[PDB]
């Protein structure tokens, strides 16, 4: 029985109080419904930043570019973040968005097959530019909210245009919290290199009853701010609005 208004108010101000700007979309079924303290970013266009990493395990995968037990040997050379100097299979590296294995896997498919596949599966504005190892994180690629919301909607009910397999494999990798007997599938991204930075956290709750509603946040990254904004706006407002 709370109104609109109230869970409106309420969400909104989960962003107010984070001091920034930003906008959760939810789905359920066919419907979008948009909160937040900046709605309008809802269909502006953003780099997709780790939120990548999802579409690429699922081209590396489909195209035997590696498989889900594979691991990804650490160099030996220094990292951005310490917890990236270990060698990882492709699910640990999509829970640690260990971008050097990611990148890796983007040199393996190839710049030719990788604009074929993003273009094939029609991501965002489908440009990857020239470089194969970074367009997901400087540009050219960019996406909007409701087209992140909309991509978690077709991988979690498994009408993306690869093998049921493969987006099932990759599925696996997304599963980030357990709430009573909820599941949330998500990926984060930070575009630390753009200006202004952009946060992101998409996918979706699977209920218990097996209903699943995708989700897209997307707000500005300021200087100092934990990542974890991004997870805590997102359990809130899906608790708010009865969903986890
Ligand atoms: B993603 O989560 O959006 C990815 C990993 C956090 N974001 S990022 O590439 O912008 C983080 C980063 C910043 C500077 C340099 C590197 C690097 O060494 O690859 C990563």
């Known amino acids: 029985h709370i109104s609109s208004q109230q869970h409106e108010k309420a969400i909104k101000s989960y962003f107010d109080e984070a001091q920034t700007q930003g906008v959760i979309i939810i789905k359920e079924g066919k419907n979008l419904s948009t909160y937040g303290n900046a709605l309008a970013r809802a269909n502006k266009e953003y780099v997709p930043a780790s939120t990548f990493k999802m579409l690429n395990a699922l081209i590396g995968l489909e195209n035997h570019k590696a498989t889900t037990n594979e691991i990804f040997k ?9 917890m990236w100097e270990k060698d990882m299979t492709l699910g640990e590296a999509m ?3 260990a971008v050097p294995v990611y990148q890796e896997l983007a040199r393996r498919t190839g710049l030719e097959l990788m604009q074929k596949e993003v273009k ?6 489908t440009n990857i530019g020239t470089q194969v190892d970074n367009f997901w994180l400087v540009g050219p690629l960019k996406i909007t909210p409701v087209q992140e919301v909309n991509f978690a909607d077709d991988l979690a009910h498994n009408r993306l245009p690869f093998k049921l ?5 990759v599925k696996k990798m997304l599963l980030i919290k357990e709430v009573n007997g909820s599941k949330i599938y998500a990926k984060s991204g930070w575009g630390m290199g753009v200006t202004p930075q952009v946060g ?7 209920q218990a009853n097996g209903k699943k509603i995708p989700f897209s946040l997307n707000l500005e990254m300021k200087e100092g701010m934990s990542g974890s904004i991004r997870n805590e706006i997102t359990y809130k407002s899906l608790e708010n609005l009865g969903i986890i």
Request: proline letters at 3%; charged letters at 30%.
């Open 200 to 206: 992101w956290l998409t996918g979706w709750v699977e």
């Open 120 to 125: 094939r599966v029609n991501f965002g504005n």
């Open 74 to 82: 650490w160099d030996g050379k220094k990292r951005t973040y310490p």
């Open 165 to 169: 397999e493969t987006q099932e494999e």
């Open 95 to 97: 829970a640690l968005s």
